[PDB]
């Protein structure tokens, strides 16, 4: 942290943050969500990290170069160490990216190495070549070299993601799936794991071996797993919580803005809220049904009437303010809701649905006050505007993500947040073979447009190709875009260091500090 001259620090430097739910895991190769990444960034540090404003900056790598955007050479600082005092080396990165690639690890983020185009990844994921063929090598203990199969000018932007953080081979090999227990885990970020009580709390304590430990201020941070946004706000206002999770309750937000305006932080966020349709299951494999659902949802009611927290009605998957996004707003978005409704009804009647044999399906969402209220409103809108019946189902976070990967579902509430600020961070997840493709969407046309983006060495052509990729997605109604998020959360006046300038919201508790109060 960089504490400003003149600020008086509190004697006790502890922090309590709500983290939305129980994490899937603390293993960097078994995670895919925001709650998981919030904890991962304090524990495991990759080649680069985001600075306090979100710019990619030195992590374990103090400096790096590229050759033709294809061969990337990372010079690792000599004093990077794990929490047991052993050096962090380029061999750790070799083992770790190989483990991420290995199909036996079954990482949800296995395709992140496809997104970066590391050499031989397709064959490794397919079981054709062993993980040791991956295009990574340690030239020495402090030099990590990555070889890509094509020029990727934005490659380094990907490297702040937790899936490309190192994992300690001896602990993994010795303890298998219990390697992340507090008695066994070893970490190289600013913090170490102290306590982990499922469904109660995760407590981290400063890691004195962290190379940048002298600048760390917070000695202990607790992450809670509270999925009720109302309860989160209540325990923030009671004094227990210093920073809520960034999901705000419909019950209280308007009141909060008038009561504690200075604590209500609202900033740009590169995330999209949408209803994910299971494209491989009838009757959702019919474009008419997916289009009808997409058009009949009334975004103005949901966004400005039922939620009204600053979100913007959405007509695409990639948020339009992503760096490199130059999207074409579809004509249906400018129509009246009435005109959308008639088209939707017309399509469902064409698809064979009637008053007597209506369309009925499940709407799955992760336990939450906010998602439940939005799902109920969506259910009523769809009933009124299209005659469709939905059965709401809630599931805890970890189980919910597993259901979507399983493709045991009809429609699910969903949200994707960028891992790097570039349209492919969104678009690559809709590729036929992507490990993140929970829409189970498979379009050769869509795959071709994205493949073509690294075959040109021109930014305008790439942006035009991303615009057309969004048009293909929309044409197929792969999803139901709902709104582009704002990052809305409460932060106590004494929490210093949170700028709200990072559109990815990649916070590191090593950057925060507690002001005397
Ligand atoms: U004190
Ligand atoms: U650039
Ligand atoms: U940029
Ligand atoms: U269903
Ligand atoms: U509630
Ligand atoms: U460029
Ligand atoms: U105080
Ligand atoms: U105190």
Curated annotation (Swiss-Prot):
Tell me which UniProt keywords the record has, alphabetically.
Answer: Disulfide bond, Peptide transport, Periplasm, Protein transport, Signal, Transport
List GO molecular-function terms, semicolon-separated.
Answer: peptide transmembrane transporter activity
**Lipoprotein as a keyword?**
no
Q: Show the disulfide pairing.
A: 271-417
Do you know what upregulates this one? Part of the opp operon, which is constitutively expressed.
> CDD domains, per this entry?
PBP2_OppA (cd08504)
GO-annotated biological processes: peptide transport; protein transport
GO CC terms for this protein?
ATP-binding cassette (ABC) transporter complex; outer membrane-bounded periplasmic space
Can you say where in the cell this protein is located?
Periplasm
Instruction: Quote the disruption phenotype from the UniProt entry.
Output: Mutant cannot take up cell wall peptides.
Residue spans crossing the bilayer: none
Does Ribosomal protein show up as a keyword for this record?
no
Q: Name one Pfam family in it.
A: SBP_bac_5
Task: Please state which protein family the record places this protein in.
Answer: Belongs to the bacterial solute-binding protein 5 family.
Q: Tell me what else is known.
A: Isothermal titration calorimetric measurements of the binding of lysine-containing peptides of different lengths to OppA show that the dipeptide Lys-Lys is bound with 60-fold lower affinity than related tri- and tetrapeptides (Lys-Lys-Lys and Lys-Lys-Lys-Ala, respectively).
Domain comment quoted from the record: Accommodates the ligand side chains in large hydrated pockets which impose little specificity on binding. Tight binding is achieved by utilising the hydrogen-bonding potential of the main chain of the ligand.
Record's subunit section: The complex is composed of two ATP-binding proteins (OppD and OppF), two transmembrane proteins (OppB and OppC) and a solute-binding protein (OppA).
PANTHER family for the chain: PERIPLASMIC BINDING COMPONENT OF ABC TRANSPORTER, PERIPLASMIC OLIGOPEPTIDE-BINDING PROTEIN-RELATED
Role noted for this protein: Part of the ABC transporter complex OppABCDF involved in the uptake of oligopeptides, including the cell wall murein tripeptide L-alanyl-gamma-D-glutamyl-meso-diaminopimelate. Plays an important nutritional role and is involved in the recycling of cell wall peptides. Binds peptides containing from two to five amino acid residues regardless of their sequence. Also binds cell wall peptides, such as L-alanyl-gamma-D-glutamyl-meso-diaminopimelate.
What is the recorded name of this protein?
A: Periplasmic oligopeptide-binding protein OppA
Query: What organism is recorded for this protein?
Result: Salmonella typhimurium (strain LT2 / SGSC1412 / ATCC 700720)
